[PDB]
Amino acid sequence: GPMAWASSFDAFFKNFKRESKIISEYDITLIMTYIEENKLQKAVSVIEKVLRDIESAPLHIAVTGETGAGKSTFINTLRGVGHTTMKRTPYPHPKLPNVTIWDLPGIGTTNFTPQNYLTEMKFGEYDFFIIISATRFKENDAQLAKAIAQMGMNFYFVRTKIDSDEEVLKNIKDYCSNHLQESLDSEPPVFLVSNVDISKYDFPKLETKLLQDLPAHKRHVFSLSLQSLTEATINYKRDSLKQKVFLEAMKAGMISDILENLDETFNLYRSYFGLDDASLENIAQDLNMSVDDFKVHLRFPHLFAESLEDKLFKYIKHISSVVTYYRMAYYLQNLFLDTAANDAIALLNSKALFEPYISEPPEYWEA
């Protein structure tokens, strides 16, 4: 009953990295206590509210520094795009409407003190600041960082690196910031980021830190904002989506019918992982084959083809083992999310992997 529901709620969220949890440790213990006290309406009301804040979370990121190719590329990276100003300029995310990346002019190109620069750029609107440079950070930049901390807000230093398509990283950091820990006195990190490959240098560490520092309810929309170009960014999306459908199942209490209603949800999920038709049709042409003949080696198109009801029956018993059960819609969504994430990971090395499926199976499904 309620006690087993509560203990199954607790065990589920222990399987996820700290920085990817879409609800706080406080809200977890809260929902547990209410369920244990059998205040079931109160618990559902809390879960509903949590889901409300996750789905409507705005994300406003201020990117401040000198103009140039590296800065524009990083702003596009935060919009999920792979391509003498004195005003800030908004750049809305093309796929998430609640997300806006702001281009702020470098403080050195204005006549503003740190405090007046921040009020001119309406600092209270943002979730955090990225202070970005292509060369070396100046005393200017360190005093702006100091002024942001004194507002009670977060900043991160990003140095962009021109690339073509270890020792380089250590040398660039000695060049770009050997005077930062003088002006600031706590030691701030610098994140080196490649202008071509988000897998390189410090960008994986940056996504992890930004997630860790954000409020729990904003982690979902941030994890979705980045393009599915590395195993790390795919898995942050996978784990965040899996938590969300579990919360939906917790608040809620003919497989072909259920599948047909999830059809729009399944297409949303495909777009998150880069498996929309257009993305797949493009990979198929680079491989010189029918897109229909391409998808034969992906697991997600034939996932719901031993009869399906028996496979699902056995799937549900594995997911239940470390009993609490949920609606069939929860298990189908969870299964589809693991299958699509695995297919997107395999396509990161598409052509070398054809040498019947190129992806790993979703756990507990085909065994």
Author numbering: -1 to 81, 94 to 175, 190 to 277, 287 to 338, 343 to 359, 367 to 399, 404 to 415
What does the paper say about this structure?
The p47 immunity-related GTPase (IRG) Irgb6 plays a pioneering role in host defense against Toxoplasma gondii infection. Irgb6 is recruited to the parasitophorous vacuole membrane (PVM) formed by T. gondii and disrupts it. The overall architectures of Irgb6 are similar to previously solved Irga6 or Irgb10 structures. They consist of an N-terminal helical domain (N-domain; amino acids 1–55; αA-αC) (purple in Fig 1A), a GTPase domain (G-domain; amino acids 56–239; H1-H5, αd, S1-S6) (green in Fig 1A), and a C-terminal helical domain (C-domain; amino acids 255–415; αF-αL) (pink in Fig 1A). The membrane-binding interface of Irgb6 assumes a unique conformation, composed of N- and C-terminal helical regions forming a phospholipid binding site.
The atomic structures of mouse Irgb6 monomer were solved in two states—with GTP and without nucleotide (nucleotide free: NF)—at 1.5 and 2.0 Å resolution, respectively. The NF structure did not have any nucleotide or ion in the pocket (NF Irgb6). The G1/P-loop (GxxxxGKS) in the GTP-bound state recognizes α- and β-phosphates of GTP, whereas that in the NF state override the corresponding binding site of the α- and β-phosphates, kicking the GDP out from the nucleotide-binding pocket of Irgb6. The G4 and following helices αd and H4 change their conformation largely from the NF state. The G-domain of NF Irgb6 exhibits a similar conformation to the NF form of Irga6, although the helix H4 and surrounding structures assume different conformations. This difference can be explained by the increased flexibility of G4 because of the absence of nucleotide, which is further stabilized by a neighboring molecule in the crystal packing environment. The helix H4 was stabilized by the interactions with the neighboring molecule. The αF-αGa loop was not visualized in the NF Irgb6 because of its high flexibility, whereas it was well defined in the GTP-bound Irgb6. The Irgb6 structures in two distinct nucleotide states take on similar conformations with overall root-mean square deviation (RMSD) of 2.4 Å. From the NF state to the GTP-bound state observed here, the conformational change of switch I pushes the αE toward the helical domains, generating rotational changes in the N- and C-domains.
